Amino acid sequence: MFAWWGRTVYQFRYIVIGVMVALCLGGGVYGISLGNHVTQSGFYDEGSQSVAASLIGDEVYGRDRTSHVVAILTPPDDKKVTDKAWQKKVTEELDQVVKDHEDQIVGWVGWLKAPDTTDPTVSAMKTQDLRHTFISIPLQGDDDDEILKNYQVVEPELQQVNGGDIRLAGLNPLASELTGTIGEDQKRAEVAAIPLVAVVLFFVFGTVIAAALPAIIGGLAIAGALGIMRLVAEFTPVHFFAQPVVTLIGLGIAIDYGLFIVSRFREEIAEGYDTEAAVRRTVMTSGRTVVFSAVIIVASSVPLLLFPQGFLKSITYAIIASVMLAAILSITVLAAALAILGPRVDALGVTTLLKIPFLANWQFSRRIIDWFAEKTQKTKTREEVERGFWGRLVNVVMKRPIAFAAPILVVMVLLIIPLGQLSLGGISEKYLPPDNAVRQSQEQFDKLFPGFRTEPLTLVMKREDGEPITDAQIADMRAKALTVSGFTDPDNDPEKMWKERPANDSGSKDPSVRVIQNGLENRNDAAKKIDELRALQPPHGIEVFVGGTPALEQDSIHSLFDKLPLMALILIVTTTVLMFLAFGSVVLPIKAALMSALTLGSTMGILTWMFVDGHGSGLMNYTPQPLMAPMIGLIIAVIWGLSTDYEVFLVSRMVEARERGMSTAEAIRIGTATTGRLITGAALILAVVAGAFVFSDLVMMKYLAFGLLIALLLDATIIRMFLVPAVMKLLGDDCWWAPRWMKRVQEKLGLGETEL
């Protein structure tokens, strides 16, 4: 089957290049418009109680808008706010921008709009020393995304109010900055990573145009994937976080997927096979591996569709779309271009890259001239001594494999320890580095006049009869709520608790629905209190609902842990069963799934140490805080899909030598030493693109990027060099065992192509 495609792609090589390069280029312009039609919501359980309790709450009583924007105004010259000239100056400016932007701003409400009012909450908007005061600026827009796009329209004119001296904080200022980091490290990754992945590409090839093709494939893959996600946006919403993931993961491993097609072809040319035959021996040894690599990542990501969060559901689409397209790009495009370039792929060399003024550029001259001087000596000689070093290192391991596996085994287990302190939370201003201008304003806002920031649990009552709800009917539900201790009462009066939620001027006050809300005492108790509140029995007609941001996160935190074992099971069994089909062996997938579970578990214990306890918060500039619930579900699906893939690389060369007649140590040594340079490049290529996104201002992007760079490092070193050879030799001849029915399944399914 795979041999059939290798021979048809050479007979049909000109038409497959034209068809595939056109589609990846067509998605380029289409992917450019994607950056505009993208939704930010999706962190809550799309279909759940706490979620649908906010739908009814925002519908009947009205979507709250007093937290869209808050603006702290301070008069200059140490003038106090009672200065009438200052009040008239700012109020005219505030009325003007509101007058200028009708389709964006709904208005501005605050103490300045009525300087002499008796409503003490509005009166408490000023400060004590009369040095500052703030306002609320509600914004238009029906959905969450429309409101932000409106704020981004009015942000410039709103900051020049009071002559610059105005502090903008609130929900929409934060959302503008958080979604703004997506494009920042996107540029950082294109200024500092695509050159470095290029210098790693010819680090492993000794040829320029050979190195260009994985970058060409890598660049082609994201251009097609970004085109797919903009098409997907027409049906169901896509998240802002999808665009970095395609670059962080899809781009890097698309180069890796192509980094294997060029090298195996050069190895086949190095043996002495002609152009027609070289594409055949590469597809069944690299293309069959690249196909199984991506399908494994697919099988390592579809169990996230079990999770309810639309945030994760959008990501798995991009991960599926990027790696499967990159794999199809690897076989269909990269193999056909090597028949067109033919044996003259290794022609240009470094000296030809020196043609255009890459030397006039500071960085590339140093990189070019080094490869030229090393071309006559260092680049070709060091490869054999490193190939020999890779072979010598493994026999130092296999000489006393227990001496290397046992210290490695105990260390990785000792790193899973901090995972027991995994605190989970939600998005807040803390997701930004504490030196941030917006975060400090929101923090100074909260420190100036406490009591406006509230995360209250809501009780949503709804009858289906349609009759209005009596005050005695409300009194019964309000009576039951007083049994669950732990809700606030600064009034110290039990009647003053669980007030009626404010009603907006935009909600059909269907009297079948009435909602009351009160603020918790300890957010940690939410998981327990919402359980207690949901445990209360409903009224003669109505059905209760527990909502608010605590119930929203605590349900999303909960919704992860339920589907997680079913995810872990589906993930483990589908990755393991796909590795057996690839290797033909059975115990290697069972062994790899251990090492994969050994790698994934150790990495999240480091992340928990440095991100929840803050061992590194002082250096990388962030603040230790409870992690995001869908994030740990994501990073589980990623590390597994990566650890599995790099083990697919190291072992697929051993099944080649084993099924070629060689001994087990021959199979291991052939596997590790012939790849010891390839995987290290693929590791560095990702460690480059991952290193870019690690400097992100968004702490959760730091989390995903560190978890990549950490586990990717362990897969390239401790597992590839040490643990795999140590554990494999203890198996000996057992490494390749397989029941015949299990084999014949692989063999007659068109995939039992064991060796060449």
Ligand SMILES: CCCCCCCCCC(=O)OC[C@H]1O[C@H](O[C@H]2O[C@H](CO)[C@@H](O)[C@H](O)[C@H]2O)[C@H](O)[C@@H](O)[C@@H]1O
């Ligand atoms: C089907 C899902 C519907 C869930 C209900 C959402 C409708 C509006 C709810 C509420 O009025 O405000 C929503 C919360 O917004 C912030 O939380 C985050 O919002 C998005 C993700 O949804 C995120 O991108 C943003 O950066 C966060 O600010 C507030 O923090 C919450 O307090 C609000 O409840």
Ligand SMILES: CCCCCCCCCC(=O)OC[C@H]1O[C@H](O[C@H]2O[C@H](CO)[C@@H](O)[C@H](O)[C@H]2O)[C@H](O)[C@@H](O)[C@@H]1O
């Ligand atoms: C790879 C497969 C591994 C599967 C392992 C599944 C283990 C499930 C563990 C359990 O479900 O979680 C226990 C509780 O953890 C949290 O409790 C704290 O979390 C935060 C912050 O500390 C907070 O929301 C909560 O109040 C804390 O007690 C969850 O929040 C709880 O819901 C879990 O029950």
